[PDB]
Amino acid sequence: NLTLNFGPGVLRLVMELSGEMVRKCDPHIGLLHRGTEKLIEYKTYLQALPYFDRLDYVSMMCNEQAYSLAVEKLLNIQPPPRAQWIRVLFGEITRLLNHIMAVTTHALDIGAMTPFFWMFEEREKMFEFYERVSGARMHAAYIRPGGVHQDLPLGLLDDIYEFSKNFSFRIDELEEMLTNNRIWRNRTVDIGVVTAEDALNYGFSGVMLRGSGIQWDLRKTQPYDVYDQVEFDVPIGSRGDCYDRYLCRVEEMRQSLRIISQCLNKMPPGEIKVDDAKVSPPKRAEMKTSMESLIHHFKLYTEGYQVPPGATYTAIEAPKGEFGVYLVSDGSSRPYRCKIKAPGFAHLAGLDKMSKGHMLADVVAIIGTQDIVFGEVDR
Amino acid sequence: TYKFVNMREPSMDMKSVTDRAAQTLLWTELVRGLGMTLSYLFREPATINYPFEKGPLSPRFRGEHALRRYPSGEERCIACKLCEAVCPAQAITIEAEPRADGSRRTTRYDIDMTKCIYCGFCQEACPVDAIVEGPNFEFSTETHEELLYNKEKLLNNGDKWEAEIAANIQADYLYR
Amino acid sequence: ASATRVIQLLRNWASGRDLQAKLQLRYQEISKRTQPPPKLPVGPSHKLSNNYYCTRDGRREAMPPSIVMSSQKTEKKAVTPAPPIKRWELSKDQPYL
């Protein structure tokens, strides 16, 4: 029984070994604690929006959507239908990006490293859509608490359709590399098994629930934008091991493709932000020709909108699990409190139980199957 | 609705057992993976020959900042300080005073590009299209000091990139 | 892709699927980089009349939360926070993988 320190996302891990086995695993976090929640209290809501891109920097628009939904609930407004459809479209695109990241980096840590490039080409393509729609590849800040910042450029939907019609064979090549491979199975099968009761008690969410046979999904049970107007299936695991969660994430990629097709077909016309110039800024032409519009633009970009007092907890089904925000407003344009709940915190808390009586090399597999990004863990 | 990913029961007849035994003993799935990799070897790579080819961009792309001016040649900035107030990172510092002709103009306009997060809030809070975040992205520096822009640097950037800045604003201003 | 027929046959046999149908490199089939001007319709509250703001203000309709049993101030059947969630259906599109 020797204690060894795997030091410098970036993680420090203190583990005691009895030979090959692991006896106690202790993750030491805080190497990426920037103090985001305290810095939010010194900003307005619009100024506090870009922090959420950096929270979970693999699934940006999902954090944007969760923050926007919380602020909408506190403001007592609702976005226009086209804004909601665009939000769900880009949320599914973001889910595809996150699942590519998770699976490819998991396999890379295992030692495969070829699907990483195969799928990072598609990640680059998806990046172009983000760049085209907003002007930034990763931290777009596109989804706003009133809707979306701007409308789609005239050629975006055709390119999204052309990209999404060839993605299935990319997933298929990934599955050829990984799904039926015996080395991959021996690396992932029967590793990190967690029971349904223990997964539920420990605060797990997302695949960590679904992999254990629990039939739960926030997009189905508690739909938020237009997710009740689209049809998709929810893959459910049977053994609660790493292999089942890998299969679940791949099937989520396929279901995200299905939802993307539906969202492309049913995109409605109309405006993109709530037509209430005391929350969403007016158009540049209106600001430059009208007096109320200029006053409202000035006040919104200097002071911001005042949110009625109250506290909410708004959660969404982010690609990593339940991502929530507990937002407390004292009645001003500056949030009084913003607690950020990320599934990675609970997953890394459960890491210690998840790695009982396993090899040293299996800890890497467990960390990979939890898909821990330390920006959301440390905040 | 929901799906099952791994509740497939393998057949226990002699043919399926023999197929599984042949798979174990002759490594069929490993050779299948080898075939997939071999197939991927014989197709064209996705690499572009930088710096001769450049990755695609859009008029909405936001890179290095610039301060623009009117066609007469007189700077658009009126020291309203809305870009300074909206800046999430507090990366803009502005000081103003009446000019010799009484114009409302800035005597100091600094952007700390090491504090900037390139969100574009400044260029959308500007009522006169004075501050823009242009399409340049190749401005890496050998020292920290040269990434601290002042009014002269931003004005030079505007004069340098005005052609395609105006082209991009023309292409994208109907969505704003 | 400007690949010879023999190389296409070799890659298709090695992969087992027809690669030329759906290529992962983008070609002239993408949309043009220069597009016509848009029009971007206005919102629903862009009316000139019967558009008073007091009738369409969400924020002022927010109210402080309703208090029940302020402690400082019959059969009675038991209740639940919500009706029990009804069981999910088994995806009659591809129930099993």
Partner: peptide, 29 residues
Amino acid sequence: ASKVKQDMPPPGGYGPIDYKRNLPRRGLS
């Protein structure tokens, strides 16, 4: 004057998109 023009799906919608897993069998006992 001008009529509304924004990004919309074409008339009749887009073509079907394949999403099911496609793992063929080469075939040998």
